[PDB]
Amino acid sequence: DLFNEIIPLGRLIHMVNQKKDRLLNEYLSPLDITAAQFKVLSSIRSAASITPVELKKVLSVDLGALTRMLDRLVCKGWVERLPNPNGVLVKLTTGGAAISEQSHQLVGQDLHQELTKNLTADEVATLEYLLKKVLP
Amino acid sequence: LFNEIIPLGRLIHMVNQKKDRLLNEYLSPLDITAAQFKVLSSIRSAASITPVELKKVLSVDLGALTRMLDRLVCKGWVERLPNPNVLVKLTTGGAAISEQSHQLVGQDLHQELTKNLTADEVATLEYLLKKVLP
Numbered sequence: 439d440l441f442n443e444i445i446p447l448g449r450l451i452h453m454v455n456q457k458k459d460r461l462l463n464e465y466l467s468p469l470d471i472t473a474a475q476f477k478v479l480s481s482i483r484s485a486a487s488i489t490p491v492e493l494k495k496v497l498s499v500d501l502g503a504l505t506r507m508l509d510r511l512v513c514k515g516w517v518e519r520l521p522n523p524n525g526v527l528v529k530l531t532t533g534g535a536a537i538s539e540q541s542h543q544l545v546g547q548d549l550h551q552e553l554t555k556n557l558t559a560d561e562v563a564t565l566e567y568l569l570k571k572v573l574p
Numbered sequence: 575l576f577n578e579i580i581p582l583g584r585l586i587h588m589v590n591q592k593k594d595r596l597l598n599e600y601l602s603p604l605d606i607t608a609a610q611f612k613v614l615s616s617i618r619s620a621a622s623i624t625p626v627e628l629k630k631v632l633s634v635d636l637g638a639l640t641r642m643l644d645r646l647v648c649k650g651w652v653e654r655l656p657n658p659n660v661l662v663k664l665t666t667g668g669a670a671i672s673e674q675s676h677q678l679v680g681q682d683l684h685q686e687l688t689k690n691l692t693a694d695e696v697a698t699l700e701y702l703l704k705k706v707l708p
Binding site for chain 1 (some may be wrong): 575576579580581582583585587588589590591592593594595598601607608609633634635637638639641642680683684687689690691695696698699700702703704705707708
């Protein structure tokens with residue numbers, strides 16, 4: 439169906455990313471957390487502690503939308519706000535770290551399987567290889 | 575990167591983030607953000623659409639979109655309507671900025687995204703991306 443059409447790479451990545459997110463939300467639901475919440479927790483996890491400004495920059499949504507999201511995450515008791523040595527820093531609580539780990543573990547196996555169902559082991563390798571080549 | 579085995583999911587995530595940064599860069603001359611761009615695009619293609627539906631087709635939070643629509647309406651690009659049962663749709667100026675928006679970034683985006691790729695490699699990547707989608 440799509441295999442008659444010449445579709446720009448931008449849209450294809452968009453489309454494939456939408457699919458990733460839908461799968462993420464599906465597999466995450468047992469833990470009562472959304473794709474969006476997951477991604478924000480992960481960005482904080484990897485920075486350890488991070489400026490909302492910076493976090494805004496690293497996630498590419500709007501400044502207000504993130505403040506609101508952080509509000510919820512804080513209420514959920516997964517994130518906490520802090521004065522940094524200067525401005526505020528955000529960082530995972532214990533419970534944030536745990537749900538992020540559980541979150542990652544619940545989701546990784548099923549996601550791979552679903553994303554690659556229609557691909558050869560060799561096609562998978564090629565696609566990964568070529569995706570990297572875009573990044574530099 | 576080429577020593578590591580990276581899950582397809584993250585690779586898509588990563589490559590998507592790059593697409594957006596390029597979008598924002600190339601959109602700036604028009605004073606519109608990648609986010610705003612995508613929201614104008616989704617409304618364009620549906621012609622007119624429920625915020626509930628629009629929330630579903632874009633996968634971001636319902637409140638965040640209401641705020642976004644608020645801004646877009648103030649910008650004079652979107653307008654709200656009572657439907658035969660609210661609906662959003664582009665204004666004239668919204669349509670014009672969406673079209674201009676598309677035309678300004680299309681060429682440069684391709685070039686940047688594919689700079690490190692053969693014509694053939696690009697064909698293969700598009701083919702294989704399509705294979706994920708079903």
